[PDB]
Chain A
Amino acid sequence: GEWRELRYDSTCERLYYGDDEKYFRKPYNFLKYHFEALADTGISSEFYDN
């Protein structure tokens, strides 16, 4: 799910995303390994002034 990476080809004028890393072999010892993209950010600011 992260494979998307840019390459450029001078011989045909394409800026495009490479076929590399698209698949992995899972080891038998991993029941599943899922490849879903997520992020989560949490921010606080507190100010007090007297």
Chain B
Amino acid sequence: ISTIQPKANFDAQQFAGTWLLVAVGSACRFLQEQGHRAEATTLHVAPQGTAMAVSTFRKLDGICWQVRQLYGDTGVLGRFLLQARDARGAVHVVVAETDYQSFAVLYLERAGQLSVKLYARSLPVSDSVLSGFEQRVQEAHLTEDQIFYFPKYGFCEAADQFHVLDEV
């Protein structure tokens, strides 16, 4: 197992706001067997230090939800530990390829297994960006069939109080 380099001179004061989920590269059996009836999903990001401050917004069975999180940093710029907030423990988190105007690609790892995510800052995504992300999926040693593509419509933000998790 080996670690990719993060985005050089990344900055959470400039990489910020919304990011609509395009797709996820992962080997995990959940997306293979449960993965049907998937949900519209987006990241939302703000500065607090070297560590990113983050939310995910998502629908669950037609009700909108928010996952608040802090990406506590590893001492390396653009590398984080997900603050180990539950018994699954830490997740290694990285920003790997991006331009803050149009797209972001993230790597996430736990229990020795790599996974990757593609985002665009608005509804559409370029096929050149999607082709570059498939190389990041192949650098995660995954196939394009282990890419799962998420709802290109029906995104949500600003959920009510009882639909934010407060995980931090």
Contact = CB atoms under 8 A, between A and B. Distances in A.
Nearest to B41: A13
A13 B28 CA distance: 10
Interface stretch (A3-11, A22-30, A40-48): A3-11
Interface residues of A, number: 12
A21 B41 CA distance: 29
Given A6-B165, A8-B167, A15 B67 contact: yes
A15 B63 CA distance: 12
A9 B86 CA distance: 10
Interface of B: 21, 24, 26, 28, 30-31, 34, 38-39, 41, 56, 58, 60, 65, 67, 69, 82, 86-88, 91, 93, 108-110, 113, 115, 148, 150, 165, 167
